[PDB]
């Protein structure tokens, strides 16, 4: 599952199908809290799909976009923390690029 977390950014790209499937596949009064938890889990799933939708990456695990070269000595949980402060800019740019791509329709 998360076994590739400590390897390298490149190699970990080969386990994307494992992680994607495992996040969706998984008396009653106090239990309302569990019902709320189930609904929230569904919304989290859809939130990611909805971002892929507006960015034009729907249905993909590896999406090519329109917006040094290491990928060996750095891993996920390192590199992605370093760009935490830049990431929101990127997300805005990904949406903007798709908004312009949509002109051709």
């Amino acid at each position: 599952f998360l076994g590739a977390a400590g390897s390298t950014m490149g190699a970990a790209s080969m386990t994307l199908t494992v992680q994607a499937r495992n996040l969706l596949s998984g008396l009653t009064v106090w239990g309302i809290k569990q019902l709320q938890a189930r609904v929230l889990a569904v919304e989290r799933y859809l939130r990611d799909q909805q971002l892929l939708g507006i960015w034009g990456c729907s249905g993909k695990l590896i999406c090519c976009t329109n917006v040094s070269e290491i990928w060996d000595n750095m891993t996920w949980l390192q590199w992605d923390k370093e760009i935490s402060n830049y990431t929101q800019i990127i997300y805005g740019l990904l949406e903007e690029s798709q908004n312009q791509q949509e002109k051709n329709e």
């Binding site: 977390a5 400590g6 494992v18 994607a20 990611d48 990456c57 999406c63 090519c64 990904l94």
Partner: protein, 436 residues
């Protein structure tokens, strides 16, 4: 900047974990999800993760859940408000040993019955700890008219079972397998799991009973070791066995208190009356402290004298070792254990115990449970798995450190097992520069 989905990353997060258990018990009727007969764990090669057992929200959740279940279990039960009446006691002197003189009293009183227009006169025994003399000798219960006293239901068991906490989808629990981890900082050899191991919700004070043992020497964990305001949690390598008993062959009278309600009164003791007590192997205890002392010297100096002493003060919940054995509530004197000075250079220890029925559970003022009596002789065996210690405020003006038993806050008991676990939220979506 390529978009990837299914990326193995996460961030620390606080969520609600659900309880699961292996296959009338308070946790069994809650932790309804069966556990995996063959749980799996995933080793994460080359993953270093920062752990902090003193900031672990899993502990705070467990604390809240244990209290909530306890209180919910006591809701559909008998209120003992109808019993807050003047009681009339005579000391019980019927073949009672010296150490039990004055411990039991026999009171008569006027209580309710099946019909609201009838009353009955009954007699019952009380432990002195539950009864206050009002200045024949007139008595009332402790906090008779200020606390809400609820009878525990005879049908519910509070025996701890090894309950597991499991992650909801989108979350994972990470374990620190480093055999010497001291509760804070980076940990290598991190694994991903779906559920914690089974943790028995054992309630105790000075000594931590049952649960796990350290594999490599005694491990001493504290938040701030030089700060006397903090407790020291000491994990042992081998357990110390304790044999405890309530030797008196007591009986139980189930009497009617209302239309569909029963009250359980302590009846005449069938056998002779003796003091409750716990047995600790003497050699085992002495070896155990020697191991603890060596590890303490590593923090306090190899030329420092280590001394053990009893509790500095407080009420029974912190000055005695308290525990529950089969529903009975014990308050044991540990001054017989923590009495030595350690120099750098077939017997047993008997700890006398007191029994009390009205319990100020979780240290809440005004809320108490009445523990019904249990008939027959009660025995239990337990494992000391760890100690809670504090140090005297002697500053630096000493060549000797004095350690005393701690206790009180329950969060520290639960931290003894939930120290290797961390909860993280999985964030599968991310981006990276690629040649595309």
């Amino acid at each position: 900047v390529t978009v990837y989905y299914g990326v193995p990353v996460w961030k620390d997060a606080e969520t609600t974990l659900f309880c699961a258990s292996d296959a009338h018990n308070v946790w069994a009727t809650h932790c309804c999800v069966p556990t995996d007969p063959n749980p799996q764990e995933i080793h994460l090669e080359n993953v270093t993760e920062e752990f902090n057992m003193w900031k672990n929200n899993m502990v705070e959740q467990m604390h809240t859940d244990i209290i909530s279940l306890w209180d919910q279990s006591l809701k559909p039960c008998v209120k003992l408000t109808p019993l807050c009446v003047t009681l009339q006691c005579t000391n019980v002197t019927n073949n009672i040993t010296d150490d039990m003189r004055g411990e039991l009293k026999n009171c008569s009183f006027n209580m309710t019955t099946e019909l609201r227009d009838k009353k009955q006169k009954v007699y019952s025994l009380f432990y002195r700890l539950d009864v206050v003399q009002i200045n024949n000798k007139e008595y009332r219960l402790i906090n008779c008219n200020t606390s809400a006293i609820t009878q525990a239901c005879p049908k519910v068991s509070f025996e701890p079972i090894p309950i597991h906490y499991c992650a909801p989808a989108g979350f994972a629990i990470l374990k620190c397998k480093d055999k010497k981890f001291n509760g804070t900082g980076p940990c290598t050899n991190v694994s991903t799991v779906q559920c914690t191991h089974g943790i028995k919700p054992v309630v105790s004070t000075q000594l931590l009973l049952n649960g796990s043992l350290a594999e490599e020497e005694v491990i001493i964990r504290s938040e701030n070791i030089t700060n006397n305001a903090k407790n020291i949690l000491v994990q042992l390598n081998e357990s110390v066995q304790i044999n405890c008993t309530r030797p008196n062959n007591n009986t139980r009278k189930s009497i009617r208190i209302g239309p569909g309600q029963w009250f359980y009164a302590t009846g005449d003791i069938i056998g002779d009356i003796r003091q409750a007590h716990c047995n600790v192997s003497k050699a085992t205890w002495n070896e155990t402290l020697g191991k603890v002392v060596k590890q303490l010297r590593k923090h306090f100096g190899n030329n420092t004298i280590i001394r053990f002493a009893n509790s500095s003060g407080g009420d029974l919940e912190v000055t005695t070792h308290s525990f529950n054995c089969g529903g009975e509530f014990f308050y044991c004197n540990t001054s017989g254990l923590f009495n030595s000075t350690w120099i750098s250079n077939n017997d047993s220890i008997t700890l006398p115990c007191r029994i009390k029925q009205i319990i100020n559970m979780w240290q809440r003022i005004g809320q108490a449970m009445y523990a019904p009596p249990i008939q027959g002789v009660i025995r239990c065996v337990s494992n000391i798995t760890g100690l809670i210690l504090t140090r005297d405020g002697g500053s630096t003006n000493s060549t000797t450190e004095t350690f005393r038993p701690g206790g009180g806050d329950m969060r520290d008991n639960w931290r003894s097992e939930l120290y290797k676990y961390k909860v993280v939220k999985i964030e599968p979506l991310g981006v990276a520069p690629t040649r595309c």
